[PDB]
Design a binder for this molecule. Structure first.
Ligand code: 40S
Ligand code: 40S
Ligand code: 40S
Length: 180
């Protein structure tokens, strides 16, 4: 996409959970299930505002635990998240370090969703004892997402991807150039 960001409506991803998603990088939280997405897909960098992932809705499915490769299941439910947040490239190199020159993480995945625990998404998705998974995602209409957006936390906040057609398309827009 613009900026060299890798923004595909469907693909393979890794998955983790995180806490404290009430002041996320898009500048609006939401009451439904939410996630952070890796920087290369988010479409912005820390401090540069919302990227084009902001507000888009995705159906996530886990089907492997790379840390317990003999575990056969059960996995969790497929859930629909709204992306509200950035999983930065400069932080966790295991999961969100994808760049334009090296577009997969340490699990070989080109995308990562960090699912916010606070509002219930991770309890639907991760079986007890299996908090890091790999699997798939597909962008869906936000008609498939229960929830209400929070208020703007700063000027420029954006979740306008919530009404956009699936990628390829533009809503909030990408900021600067993707990490190399
Ligand atoms: C759980 C929500 C209550 C306000 O709608 C806040 C989540 O950001
Ligand atoms: C064959 C493995 C067990 C698979 O559940 C054990 C030996 O690596
Ligand atoms: C996390 C899930 C594992 C069972 O498939 C349960 C969600 O209800």
């Amino acid at each position: 996409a613009t900026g060299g960001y890798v923004q595909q409506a469907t693909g393979q991803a890794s998955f983790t959970m995180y806490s404290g998603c009430g002041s996320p990088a898009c500048g609006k939280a939401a009451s439904g299930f939410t996630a952070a997405i890796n920087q290369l897909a988010f479409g912005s960098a820390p401090g540069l505002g919302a990227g084009d992932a902001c507000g888009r809705c995705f159906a996530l499915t886990g089907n492997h635990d790379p840390y317990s490769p003999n575990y056969t299941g059960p996995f969790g439910q497929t859930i629909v998240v709204k992306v509200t947040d950035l999983c930065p490239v400069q932080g966790d190199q295991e999961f969100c370090g994808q760049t334009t020159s090296n577009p997969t993480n340490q699990h070989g995945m080109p995308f990562h969703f960090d699912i916010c625990e606070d509002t219930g998404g991770s309890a639907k998705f991760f079986p007890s004892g299996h908090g890091a998974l790999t699997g798939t995602f597909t962008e869906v209409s936000c008609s498939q997402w229960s929830g209400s957006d929070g208020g703007q936390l700063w000027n420029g906040a954006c979740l306008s991807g919530e009404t956009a057609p699936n990628w390829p398309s533009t809503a909030c827009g990408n900021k600067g150039t993707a990490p190399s």
